[PDB]
Write an enzyme that holds these catalytic residues in place. Sequence first.
Site, mmCIF file in Angstrom:
data_model
loop_
_atom_site.group_PDB
_atom_site.id
_atom_site.type_symbol
_atom_site.label_atom_id
_atom_site.label_comp_id
_atom_site.label_asym_id
_atom_site.label_seq_id
_atom_site.Cartn_x
_atom_site.Cartn_y
_atom_site.Cartn_z
ATOM 1 N N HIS A 133 0.765 -1.219 -0.078
ATOM 2 C CA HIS A 133 0.148 0.196 0.184
ATOM 3 C C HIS A 133 0.862 1.103 0.072
ATOM 4 C CE1 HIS A 133 -3.683 -2.197 0.468
ATOM 5 N NE2 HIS A 133 -3.452 -2.512 1.603
ATOM 6 N N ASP A 171 -2.269 -10.911 -2.236
ATOM 7 C CA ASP A 171 -2.781 -10.362 -1.082
ATOM 8 C C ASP A 171 -4.152 -9.958 -1.169
ATOM 9 O OD1 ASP A 171 -1.751 -8.623 1.691
ATOM 10 O OD2 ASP A 171 -3.462 -7.860 0.892
ATOM 11 N N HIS A 173 -5.913 -7.507 -0.643
ATOM 12 C CA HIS A 173 -6.288 -6.163 -0.987
ATOM 13 C C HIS A 173 -5.407 -5.764 -1.980
ATOM 14 C CE1 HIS A 173 -6.695 -6.645 3.610
ATOM 15 N NE2 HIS A 173 -7.924 -5.872 3.152
ATOM 16 N N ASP A 264 -4.049 -13.106 3.596
ATOM 17 C CA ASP A 264 -5.255 -12.656 4.242
ATOM 18 C C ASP A 264 -6.583 -13.105 3.441
ATOM 19 O OD1 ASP A 264 -4.192 -10.668 2.388
ATOM 20 O OD2 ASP A 264 -4.471 -8.937 3.734
ATOM 21 N N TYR A 304 -3.508 -12.169 8.831
ATOM 22 C CA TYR A 304 -3.723 -11.841 10.174
ATOM 23 C C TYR A 304 -4.117 -12.813 11.070
ATOM 24 C CZ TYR A 304 -2.750 -7.676 7.647
ATOM 25 O OH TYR A 304 -2.178 -6.801 6.967
HETATM 26 O O1 P5Y Z 1 -4.303 -6.128 4.997
HETATM 27 C C1 P5Y Z 1 -4.111 -5.159 4.645
HETATM 28 N N1 P5Y Z 1 -3.571 -4.608 3.344
HETATM 29 O O2 P5Y Z 1 -2.766 -5.758 2.787
HETATM 30 C C2 P5Y Z 1 -4.902 -4.026 5.551
HETATM 31 C C3 P5Y Z 1 -4.530 -2.404 5.332
HETATM 32 C C4 P5Y Z 1 -5.267 -1.557 5.995
HETATM 33 C C5 P5Y Z 1 -6.259 -1.794 6.774
HETATM 34 C C6 P5Y Z 1 -7.098 -0.642 7.862
HETATM 35 N N2 P5Y Z 1 -8.457 -1.058 7.904
HETATM 36 C C7 P5Y Z 1 -9.300 -0.719 6.798
HETATM 37 C C8 P5Y Z 1 -10.389 -1.436 6.704
HETATM 38 N N3 P5Y Z 1 -10.453 -2.944 6.429
HETATM 39 N N4 P5Y Z 1 -11.861 -3.270 6.844
HETATM 40 N N5 P5Y Z 1 -12.597 -2.417 6.955
HETATM 41 N N6 P5Y Z 1 -12.132 -0.892 7.187
HETATM 42 C C9 P5Y Z 1 -12.535 0.178 7.513
HETATM 43 C C10 P5Y Z 1 -13.645 0.783 6.480
HETATM 44 C C11 P5Y Z 1 -14.892 1.132 6.985
HETATM 45 C C12 P5Y Z 1 -15.771 1.588 6.159
HETATM 46 C C13 P5Y Z 1 -15.614 2.119 4.791
HETATM 47 C C14 P5Y Z 1 -14.373 1.470 4.430
HETATM 48 C C15 P5Y Z 1 -13.260 0.973 5.086
HETATM 49 C C16 P5Y Z 1 -9.046 -1.025 9.275
HETATM 50 O O3 P5Y Z 1 -10.326 -0.978 9.326
HETATM 51 C C17 P5Y Z 1 -8.105 -0.893 10.500
HETATM 52 C C18 P5Y Z 1 -7.454 -0.219 11.085
HETATM 53 C C19 P5Y Z 1 -6.551 -0.401 12.204
HETATM 54 C C20 P5Y Z 1 -6.609 -1.762 12.795
HETATM 55 C C21 P5Y Z 1 -7.293 -2.454 12.370
HETATM 56 C C22 P5Y Z 1 -8.293 -2.306 11.217
HETATM 57 C C23 P5Y Z 1 -9.140 -3.512 10.586
HETATM 58 F F1 P5Y Z 1 -9.019 -3.854 9.600
HETATM 59 F F2 P5Y Z 1 -8.564 -4.827 10.963
HETATM 60 F F3 P5Y Z 1 -10.107 -3.446 11.105
HETATM 61 C C24 P5Y Z 1 -6.732 -3.342 7.076
HETATM 62 C C25 P5Y Z 1 -5.995 -4.080 6.264
HETATM 63 K K K Z 2 -3.601 -8.099 -4.475
HETATM 64 ZN ZN ZN Z 3 -4.064 -7.329 2.779
#
Ligand code: P5Y
Ligand code: K
Ligand code: ZN
Length: 357
Positions: A133, A171, A173, A264, A304
């Site tokens: 990212h 990944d 994402h 993931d 994770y």
């Molecule tokens: O794996 C990865 N990149 O390869 C990876 C990289 C970044 C994130 C961050 N992020 C986004 C996220 N993901 N699922 N919903 N949203 C929030 C959303 C709500 C409404 C509309 C859009 C988005 C967190 O929200 C976040 C932030 C801090 C701690 C934990 C978490 C978790 F996801 F676990 F809950 C996630 C994955």
């Molecule tokens: K990917």
């Molecule tokens: Zn990811």
Amino acid sequence: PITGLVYDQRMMLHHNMWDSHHPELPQRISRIFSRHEELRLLSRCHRIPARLATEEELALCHSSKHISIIKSSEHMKPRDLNRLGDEYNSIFISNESYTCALLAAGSCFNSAQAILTGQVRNAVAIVRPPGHHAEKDTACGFCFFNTAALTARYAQSITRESLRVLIVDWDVHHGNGTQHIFEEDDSVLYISLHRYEDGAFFPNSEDANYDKVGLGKGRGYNVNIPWNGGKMGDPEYMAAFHHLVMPIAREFAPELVLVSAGFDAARGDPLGGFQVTPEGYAHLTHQLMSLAAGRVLIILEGGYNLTSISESMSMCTSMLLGDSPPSLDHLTPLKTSATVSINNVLRAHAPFWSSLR
Ligand SMILES: O=C(NO)c1ccc(CN(Cc2nnnn2Cc2ccccc2)C(=O)c2ccccc2C(F)(F)F)cc1
Ligand SMILES: [K+]
Ligand SMILES: [Zn+2]
Ligand SMILES: [K+]
């Protein structure tokens, strides 16, 4: 016939001072490493040392301003670390984060070097924080510097400027940073499979859709395979490899393959929502080993569920070592929306790849 492995416990030192349960945990890498010991894979590999990326190496992909700001965090007080991290999308920073990001990148440089010198055939890099990212000018999504993108440029810097590098990003994402870094570049083919949900899945940008094929001379060299409306798993990933990833990759004829190997999309992940199995990841790894005279570097990104990522990445290392690949069911019908996704990517990329016509 040798597989390299890089792991350095110092990369555990990057940590979240305000939420110790944040999913990008220090023990992601130590759990994967411990599983390699339990399965007796570690002793079958050639241990490659970690090193720090240099600031000059970071400048292969990142702006001087971005390097300087992240570097500045090494000695910051906690309140300033908190404030800096909040300036980005989904970043936490500790005093060790910069050095850990340098170690993740330098570990992959040493691994690419070991492959390109012929010291090893292929390699696995058990590193954190992740990278895909991260953009030229900013950190994002747990990532500070784009390890895979930097490794592609590093490989070009030691072998040939135009060395054909394939980055496969499995990944769950989209690697927005990797796409952007190489968007106008026809020497680095970026192929990403990712949950998209019409833009509802992180990172929530239409840049991840199938119609983003690259820019300028890079047209055709950015392949997004976006999943919508379905709990995808082995059949869909096998199908995407069969119809899109492998035909395009073979036509590109890469000389080095980098895998942005987040785990993931694995069964059990708290975020991904998918069910790729360890055998599924082994199948994908074995397919990629047929490219680039076997020059494959698997780089940890996300993932994770500690047990899931440990088993899944270990099975990839088993494939790199030459163990027998799994047999999976190519006749299982796909989720209906996965067929639509694959057809959309095929239509988008058929103008650029004769293997799709
Ligand atoms: O794996 C990865 N990149 O390869 C990876 C990289 C970044 C994130 C961050 N992020 C986004 C996220 N993901 N699922 N919903 N949203 C929030 C959303 C709500 C409404 C509309 C859009 C988005 C967190 O929200 C976040 C932030 C801090 C701690 C934990 C978490 C978790 F996801 F676990 F809950 C996630 C994955
Ligand atoms: K990917
Ligand atoms: Zn990811
Ligand atoms: K590209």
